[PDB]
Design a protein around this ligand. Structure first.
Ligand SMILES: O=c1[nH]cnc2c1ncn2[C@@H]1O[C@H](CO)[C@@H](O)[C@H]1O
Ligand SMILES: O=c1[nH]cnc2c1ncn2[C@@H]1O[C@H](CO)[C@@H](O)[C@H]1O
Ligand SMILES: O=c1[nH]cnc2c1ncn2[C@@H]1O[C@H](CO)[C@@H](O)[C@H]1O
Ligand SMILES: O=c1[nH]cnc2c1ncn2[C@@H]1O[C@H](CO)[C@@H](O)[C@H]1O
Ligand SMILES: [Ca+2]
Ligand SMILES: [Ca+2]
Ligand SMILES: [Ca+2]
Ligand SMILES: [Ca+2]
Lengths: 283, 307, 309, 303
C-alpha cells in the first residue's frame, strides 16, 4: 500500500483520479487537498465534495490556495455533466497547506504527494516549512510537456497556471515523477472506452460516463511497469514571453546536469483502461 | 490611534521600529509577525523576542515564512546573530503557536477594515496571506512598507534588500490594489544615525536609550564600509514616524512596478516619477523627511520607557 | 530553375549543400555568402573556398559577418573540428573571396533583381538580419527564404535551441518577424537524414571528386554526431534545403505561427512553433515535418555523379 | 586637436553639437554619420544636410542605419522644427556610414574618437561587422543612458531605448567609454535668458541656435516638466574641448535587454557593490557657466 495525499482541482479527469485512488487496494488515500485551477476554488471545492459524496468516499477534503503564488489567475462549474444532489458534507476547518505540512512532519517519511492541478499548495507548504522536504517519499505529478503544451505552444495548463510554484517544486530536490502531455495525450477516451465503463455500470461507471490526464498518476502508483519513463534534467521557465511555464526537459543530456525527474514517455493503454474498469467495479 | 500589525526581520532598525510602535499613544500595536530576511527565521525570531523581553513589551509575537515564495534565499551589515551589540538576559519569552500568515488572515477577516499593515522586511508573509485569502484585500486600510528605491538600490545597483530578497512576493503586494505607502532608500538614507544622534538618546537614557545606543553603535562600522553613508540609517522606524505624523514626510504619488526579470534589475521597484506611462498611481513614494521632527520623535519614544 | 544565394558556415553538411546546389539543373546558384558559425569566419571562409576549388565550382564567394549581431560568440569545434571541416585533403588555395562584403552583395543583388531570388541560409542568420535592417527595401524583393535552423521539439546545442538559432537569436528574431515567406528545415526533419556507413559506401561507389569528398567529409561527423547526440550518423541537415528546392514533394511541411525566444535563460534561441494553432495567430512559416529518405539519398547520388569527369 | 567622427540623428540638440564640433579649434571633425532616431533616416539626413549647408560647414555627410539592429522602430515632425532652411544644394556621400566608419578606423593610427549622440545602430553594426576596429578606437564619448530616471520610460533614456541591443554591443566592447547621461545633461537646461544671450552674439549660428531652442522650450516642459530644452548632445563636444568642466565617476555599467519595465536601462554601479571593474566614465556634474561660455565662443566663430 502506497500512502498518498491527492492534491487536485476538479475537474473532469481529477474526478476519475479521485475515483481510482479512493478504491484501489494498492493506494492508501490519506486525504484530498483542493487548489484553484480548472475553475476558482469555490467551484473546484464543490466539485470535489460532490464526487466524494456521490461515490460515498470517506476521506477528509481540505480547501487550499484560491490563487497562484504570484501571477494573474487564469482558469480552463468546471465539472459539467453529472447531476448532483444538494451537498451534505463540507471542507475540514484546517487549511490544505497546514494539513500537508503537519501530516508530513508527523509522518515516517513514506507519504507520496500526488499533485494533478497547479502547484500552489505544494510550493507554499515547501517554502512555509522546508523541513517537510526529506519527509516526502516522492512526488508523482500531472503537468508539463517535453514537446508541445496545450494552453500555449510551450506550456501545459497546470504549470502555466502557476510557473513560480512549479519552479519551487522542480528545484526542491525531492524525487519527482512527471506525467506530462507527451504521455497523457496517449490516454484518449473515445466513445467505446466510455461504453465499456457504462457496461461495468454501478455509481462509478455512470459517473465516468456523465484524454484522462490525472488518472495516470494513480495508474503509475498502482503499477509503474505500465508506464515507460526516462530520467531527465528538467528546468521550469519563468520568463514572461513565449515560453512562460515551459518545463524544459533535457532528453539527450546535452547540459551534463544530473537528472531530477523521471519523465513519462509511453503508457500501455490496454493495461491502463483495464485498471480503470477494475476500479469502476469496486463501486 | 492607528491599529497596526508590524511585520519585520529584526534586524537593527527593525528593533528601533518595534521600540517606537509599542510606545507611542498614536499607534495601537496589535501584534508582531516575523519573516526571514536580515538573518534566517530561527535568528530573527529570537532577536524579535529579545527586544520585546528587554523593553518589557507585552505584544504577541508570531513566526512566519522562513523562506521567500520562489527564489533562492539570501541574508544581509547586521552580523552573525543579525542584531549584534546589545547583551540580553536569557530569553524566557516565547513565540505564539499560530503561524504568522494565519494570524494576519484571521485578524484582518475578523476586523472592521481599519488595520494598517507595516512590513519592514521582505514581503513573504504578506504575499502568502494575500494569495491564500484574497478576501483580506479590501480589509486592509493601508500598507506602509519599508522597501525599494526610485534611484540606486543598496544590495544591488538596482534593488533594495527587502524587495531583492523576495521580488515575487513584492510583485504580489504592488499589484494588490491596496493603498500603499513606500518608504524607499531615497527617503530612508536621509535618516543617518551619526554619533551625536546616539549620544542624544544615551542622554535620555532608560532601557530604550541604552538599547538604541548598543544596537546603533554596531551599524556604525558596518553601514560605512558597504555604502558610505554618514552612519546607520534607521530605515524601518520611518514607517512608524509616517503613521504618527505624515506631515514630517513628503510623498509623491507614482505608478510603481516591480521587475521580476532575472538579470541586472531583478527586484527593482520601477517608479514613474514624471508620469510618462500614463498609468494611474498605485503608491505614495517617500521623497523627503524632516530629520529634526523625526529625531525628536525618536527621543519622545525613548523617554516613554523611563520607568 | 530557382535562382538562389546560399549563405553558409562550412561546415561538413554545408559542403554537401554547396556540392548539390552548384550541380543540379533545377538550381541557379548565383553566389555563396559566408558567415561565422561552425567555426570563426577566417576558417569557414577557407573551408568554403576549398570546397569550390576541389570541386571546380565557378561561383563567386563573399565573406560576411565574423560575429553575431549582439550576443557573445560561440562555435561548434565539438561537432566540426578544429578547422571547421576536418576530413578531406585540399591543395593550397589558388582562389579567394570577392572584395565586396557579403551583406552589401546580398542587398545590391536583391535590389537589382526582379524579385525571384530565393535566399538559402544554413548557418546563423547574422548576414540576413544585417542586410534586412540595413536595407528594408530588399524585403519584398525576396521570393522566399528556405533556411536550415530551429526545432519544434528538442534542440541540439541546448535542450531548447538548435545551433544556428542559438548562435544568433536576435538575428533570428529579425528574420522570423520579416514577413517574407519562410520555409524552416528544423532538427525534427533533418535528424531523419542520418548518414550511416552504408550511405557513405553508396556515394564512394558512385565515385569521382564529389563522391570522394562526401566520404572524407561525412566520416568525420559520423563519429562526433554519435559522441554528442547519440545519432546513427552525421545528419546532412543543410542539404535538405537544396533538396526542398529541387522537389518540395519529398518533404512534408505544416504551416505554423513561429516565434523566436530572445529571453536569456533556458529557452534562449528557441523557435516556438504553434503546432496546434492555439494562439490564433496567422502562420508565418512552413515547418519541415517529414522527409522521404529514399527520394533524398537518390537525389544526393544524382548530384554526386554530375561531377564524374 | 581631437579627431572625431560625429554620429547623430538630428535633432535639435544634435544640430548644436554639429555647430560646436565643426567650429572649435580643439576638435578635428572628420565626418558626420547619420542614424535613424529622433525621426526616420530620410528626415534626419535632410536635417543634418540643412544644418551644414546653412552654417557653410564643409564636412562629408554619410547616411547609415535606417532601423535598429533588432527591435521595432520608435521615433521621438521634420525632426528639427524651428529654423527655416533654403532649398538643399548638397547631398550625402555614396559610401554607407557603417563602411565609412570601418574603413576610416582601419586606415587610422588609432587616434580617432567616436562621438555617438543618437541610437547606437551604426556603431554596433560596424563593431560586429569588423571587430578589428575595436583597438583602433581611442575612445567613445556618447550621449545616452541615465543612472537615475530615464525620459522615454522611467527606466530608459531615448537613445538607448531606441536600440538596446546595439547599446549592449557598445557597452560590452571593452573600448574606453564616456557616458553623458540624463543625470548630467538635464542640468544644461536652455532657458529664455540663455537663448537671448546667443541672439546677442548673433551671426548665422546665433540665429540658428535661437530658432532651434525656441521650439524645444515648449515640448521639453509638457513632456518632462523641464525649464527649457536641455542641450544633451553638445555636452559630448564640451567634454572633448575641456574635460575639467564635467565631473565623472568611473562605474561598471550594464545594459538591460530584457523586455519588460527596464528594457534599455543602463544599470550603473554607483557604489561598486558588484565588485566588477569599471567600464565607463559616467557624467555626474557640469559647470553650466563654463559650458554656456563655450557655446557662445563657438557661436561667435561663425561671424
Ligand atoms: O480542455 C481543457 N482545458 C483546460 N484544462 C484541461 C482541459 N483538459 C484537461 N485539463 C486539465 O489540465 C490538466 C492538463 O492539461 C489536467 O490535469 C486536466 O485536469
Ligand atoms: O546594509 C544593509 N543590507 C541589507 N539589508 C539591510 C541593510 N541595512 C538595513 N537592512 C535591512 O533591510 C532594509 C534596508 O534596505 C531594512 O528594513 C533593514 O532592516
Ligand atoms: O549536431 C550539431 N550540433 C551543432 N551544430 C551542427 C550539428 N550538425 C550540424 N551542425 C551545423 O549547425 C547547423 C545544424 O544544427 C548546420 O547548419 C551545421 O552546419
Ligand atoms: O524631449 C526629448 N525626448 C526624447 N528625445 C530627445 C528629447 N530631446 C532631445 N532628444 C534626443 O534624445 C537624446 C536624449 O534623450 C538626445 O541625443 C536628443 O537629441
Ligand atoms: Ca486537474
Ligand atoms: Ca528590516
Ligand atoms: Ca551550416
Ligand atoms: Ca540626438
Amino acid at each position: 500500500k502506497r500512502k498518498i495525499i491527492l492534491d487536485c482541482d476538479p475537474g473532469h479527469d481529477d474526478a476519475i483520479a479521485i475515483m481510482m485512488a479512493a478504491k484501489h487496494p494498492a493506494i492508501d488515500l490519506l486525504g484530498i487537498t483542493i487548489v484553484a485551477g480548472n475553475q476558482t476554488l469555490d467551484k473546484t471545492l464543490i466539485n470535489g465534495l460532490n464526487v466524494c459524496q456521490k461515490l460515498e468516499i470517506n476521506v477528509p477534503v481540505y480547501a487550499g490556495m484560491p490563487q497562484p503564488i504570484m501571477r494573474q489567475q487564469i482558469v480552463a462549474t468546471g465539472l459539467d455533466g453529472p447531476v448532483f444532489e444538494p451537498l451534505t458534507r463540507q471542507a475540514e476547518s484546517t487549511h490544505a497547506v497546514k494539513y500537508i505540512i503537519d501530516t508530513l512532519m508527523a509522518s515516517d517519511g513514506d507519504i507520496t504527494l500526488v499533485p494533478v492541478g497547479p502547484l500552489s499548495n505544494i510550493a507554499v507548504a515547501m517554502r512555509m516549512q522546508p523541513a517537510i522536504l526529506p519527509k516526502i517519499r516522492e512526488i508523482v505529478l500531472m503537468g508539463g510537456a517535453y514537446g508541445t503544451g496545450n494552453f500555449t505552444p510551450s506550456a501545459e495548463f497546470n504549470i502555466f497556471a502557476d510557473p513560480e510554484a512549479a519552479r519551487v517544486v522542480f528545484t526542491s530536490g525531492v524525487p519527482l515523477v512527471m506525467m506530462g502531455l507527451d504521455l497523457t495525450n496517449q490516454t484518449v477516451c473515445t466513445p467505446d472506452v466510455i461504453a465499456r465503463m457504462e457496461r461495468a455500470g454501478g455509481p462509478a461507471g455512470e459517473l465516468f460516463s456523465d484524454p484522462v490526464h490525472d488518472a495516470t498518476c494513480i495508474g503509475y502508483l498502482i503499477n509503474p511497469d505500465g508506464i515507460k519513463t526516462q530520467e531527465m534534467y528538467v528546468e521550469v521557465d519563468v520568463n514572461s514571453g513565449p515560453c512562460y511555464g515551459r518545463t524544459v526537459c533535457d532528453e539527450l543530456g546535452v547540459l551534463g546536469k544530473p537528472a531530477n525527474t523521471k519523465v513519462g514517455i509511453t503508457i500501455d493503454t490496454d493495461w491502463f483502461w483495464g485498471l480503470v474498469e477494475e476500479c469502476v467495479r469496486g463501486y
